[PDB]
Amino acid sequence: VPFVEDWDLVQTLGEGGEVQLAVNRVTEEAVAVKIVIKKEICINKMLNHENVVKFYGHRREGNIQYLFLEYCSGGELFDRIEPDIGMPEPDAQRFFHQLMAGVVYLHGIGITHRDIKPENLLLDERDNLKISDFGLATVFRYNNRERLLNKMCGTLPYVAPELLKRREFHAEPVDVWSCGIVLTAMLAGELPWDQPSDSCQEYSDWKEKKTYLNPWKKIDSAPLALLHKILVENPSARITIPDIKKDRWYNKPLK
Numbered sequence: 001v002p003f004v005e006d007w008d009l010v011q012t013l014g015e016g017g018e019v020q021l022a023v024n025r026v027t028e029e030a031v032a033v034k035i036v037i038k039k040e041i042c043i044n045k046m047l048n049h050e051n052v053v054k055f056y057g058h059r060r061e062g063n064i065q066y067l068f069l070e071y072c073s074g075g076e077l078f079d080r081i082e083p084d085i086g087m088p089e090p091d092a093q094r095f096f097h098q099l100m101a102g103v104v105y106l107h108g109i110g111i112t113h114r115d116i117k118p119e120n121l122l123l124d125e126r127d128n129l130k131i132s133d134f135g136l137a138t139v140f141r142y143n144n145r146e147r148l149l150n151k152m153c154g155t156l157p158y159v160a161p162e163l164l165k166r167r168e169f170h171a172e173p174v175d176v177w178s179c180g181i182v183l184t185a186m187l188a189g190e191l192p193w194d195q196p197s198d199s200c201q202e203y204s205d206w207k208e209k210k211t212y213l214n215p216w217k218k219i220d221s222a223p224l225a226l227l228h229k230i231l232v233e234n235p236s237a238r239i240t241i242p243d244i245k246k247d248r249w250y251n252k253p254l255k
């Protein structure tokens with residue numbers, strides 16, 4: 001059928017290169033086009049899940065790479081978070097369930113995202129959470145053999161303490177930690193510390209269980225009991241996702 005391959009770039013969605021909203025000339029189907037890499041496309045070709053931004057394909061027009069990705073009309077989770085407030089606890093729980101489904105899927109195929117934050121968690125028309133941007137993502141399991149990580153990747157307020165203290169670390173507890181910081185931000189509208197280091201006063205207060213301070217004071221005891229299990233300094237003692245799925249607040253009916 002003629003012109004079905006032609007796309008009009010209608011609106012800017014973000015900057016990195018850049019992300020533009022493309023509309024099909026014939027079908028009017030909307031897609032996000034990422035203008036820029038080889039690892040990102042390779043990892044994206046492996047992905048197929050309802051809580052992961054869909055990869056439609058790629059095309060190179062010279063030195064420029066075009067990534068055709070799922071357009072998420074609901075925008076970023078970041079913009080659903082009211083500063084210093086957060087969002088209704090039932091909304092945060094539903095987003096947290098969908099975030100866990102996405103992360104279980106990635107870890108199951110041996111992929112770690114390494115930069116989980118509300119800017120990278122997009123929402124479709126029905127407010128379904130989609131994990132976005134696999135530019136920092138890497139394979140941590142291949143031929144059923146786990147590879148320990150050593151590279152500094154991520155965003156300091158969401159990074160796990162072992163990434164700053166240890167030479168090598170397991171990939172999965174790092175993504176679990178960033179998910180707990182996202183959960184904190186959804187329930188309090190603020191990040192608990194600039195970074196998880198002993199030099200950071202806010203981080204020291206948390207390790208000393210001073211939950212009468214912000215952001216913890218704004219969080220109900222049931223989701224706060226979950227955060228006490230996720231934001232554990234020792235990654236070997238940190239709660240795993242199968243155990244998060246058994247948590248009392250995770251399973252609390254909320255309306």
Ligand SMILES: CCc1cc2c(cc1O[C@H]1CCOC1)Cc1c-2n[nH]c1-c1ccc(C#N)nc1
Nearest residue numbers: 013019032053069070071072073075132133134
């Ligand atoms: C119009 C709502 C909106 C949609 C979208 C975004 C951002 C959005 O918000 C706009 C509105 C003002 O600021 C940006 C960003 C975006 C969207 N769909 N897919 C993507 C998107 C972005 C990066 C990647 C990657 N890698 N994949 C998909």
